[PDB]
């Protein structure tokens, strides 16, 4: 299948003096890197996080990021002074950067920037641009950022060349983690559903990887159309948690089963009878 490599930067600027930048890196829904503000170096969160980079290529790439993090912090502080007093502290800046990998040497790279939680700027082709809906005052920051040909050449290289090359290596090195199968375990429970005579049956499903799963409340062969899947919730061990609720009438509980289909079960569906 297709995998998106996502480098997520969160930068908080409380006032002229105080700031922190924290980064996490995801390949699909698996974390590959962490870079805490407190750490001089990027941390691997998998044995295979260096992908197929030599030690010298990785050291070179890390050194570039180390200079970037310091430079970025000063650049934002200077841009605030430049736009003063239009924009003031506190300021949150987020970057989402990476590449989506497609079959047959195809990929697309992205670098999106959010200011105070709104997507306002991307890197596109050879320059920074504002996106539809961004405020006009960003034209000055963009003009200043776009004067820096050295940064533009580096960003172009990272998006066009480094990202897809690095990620092709990660996919090879991490293949056995990315393709892991972990079995769901299910269990049932019930509560009042703020309706006089109505019960809410809950089917809990936990420990499954990967994410795609099917969970249905059932009377025999009849799929209970009232079934509501909650959100996919993460477990600490890089597996998933999901619950499916059914609002029933007190007494009708008898005859209901919860059925779970998952790739890990090799066709042996879980059926739990209330």
């Amino acid at each position, epitope marked *: 299948k297709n995998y998106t490599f996502r480098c997520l930067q969160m930068s908080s600027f409380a006032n002229r003096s105080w700031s922190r930048t924290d980064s996490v890196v995801w390949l699909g829904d698996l974390q590959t890197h962490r870079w805490s503000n407190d750490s001089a170096t990027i941390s691997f969160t998998k044995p295979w996080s260096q992908g197929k980079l030599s030690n010298q290529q990785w050291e070179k790439l890390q050194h570039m990021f180390q200079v970037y993090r310091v430079s970025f912090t000063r650049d934002i502080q200077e841009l605030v*002074k*430049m736009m003063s007093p239009k924009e003031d502290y506190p300021i949150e800046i987020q970057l989402s950067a990476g590449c989506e990998m497609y079959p047959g040497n195809a990929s697309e790279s992205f670098l999106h920037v959010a200011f105070q939680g709104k997507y306002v700027v991307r890197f596109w082709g050879t320059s920074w641009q504002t996106v539809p809906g961004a405020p006009s005052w960003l034209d000055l920051p963009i003009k200043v950022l776009n*004067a*820096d040909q050295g*940064t533009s050449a580096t960003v172009q290289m990272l998006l066009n060349d480094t990202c897809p090359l690095f990620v092709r290596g990660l996919l090879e090195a991490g293949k056995s983690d990315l393709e892991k199968q972990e079995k769901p375990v299910a269990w049932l429970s019930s509560v009042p559903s703020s309706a006089h005579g109505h019960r809410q049956l809950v089917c809990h499903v936990s420990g499954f990887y990967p994410k795609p799963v099917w969970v249905m409340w059932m009377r025999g062969d009849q799929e209970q159309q009232g079934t509501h899947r909650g959100d996919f919730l993460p477990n600490a061990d890089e597996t998933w948690y999901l619950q499916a609720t059914l609002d029933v009438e007190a007494g009708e509980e008898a005859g209901l089963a919860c059925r779970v289909k998952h790739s890990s079960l090799g066709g042996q569906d879980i059926i739990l009878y209330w």
Partner: T-cell receptor
Amino acid sequence: KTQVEQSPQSLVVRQGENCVLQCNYSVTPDNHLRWFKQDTGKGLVSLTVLVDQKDKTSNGRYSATLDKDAKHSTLHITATLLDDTATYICVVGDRGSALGRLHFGAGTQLIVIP
Amino acid sequence: AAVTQSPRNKVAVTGGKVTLSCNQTNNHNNMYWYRQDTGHGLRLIHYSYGAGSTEKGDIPDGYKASRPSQENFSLILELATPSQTSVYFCASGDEGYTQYFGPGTRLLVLE
């Protein structure tokens, strides 16, 4: 003591001799490096700016090198004239935009005996 | 892209008020004040990103900056001291890295 160091501090050459001036820096990042000539009680005249990881420039009798890996630049003056008597100043800009700070060396004093 | 400074030379007394003026007709947003002392490179005192903006540089103590217009950037020594005897350089620039330097001002503060 500082982020930009020039050597020699000063030197005396005879007209027609060549000389080499050195600039070493710790500035990070190093977007570009400029050589200024400053005549006594006058202002800053740009001789050259170097921008590439390994760079070479020329401007008449002036030539310069930059090696960003070594953080080292040389200014070569071929066939010195009386009018080369000046202070030569190395400057490193830490950005390719107005967000940059300039880091100035304290200069090399050249005297050319006519 | 020209930059002018006035005065070009000033003798002042300790405790007196001295204003160093820089004028720039390039329509540059950005202006910068430095001092040059023997044994040092130029050192940044104050800078400005536009009218009404003043920012402290590396050595702002004993100086006030004023940017009343796009054209004019002034360095004010409210209580001049002998330590402010120096050559003062103004520069201007747009979004690019190039700073265009004025010709310098020689200030001597006598006791």
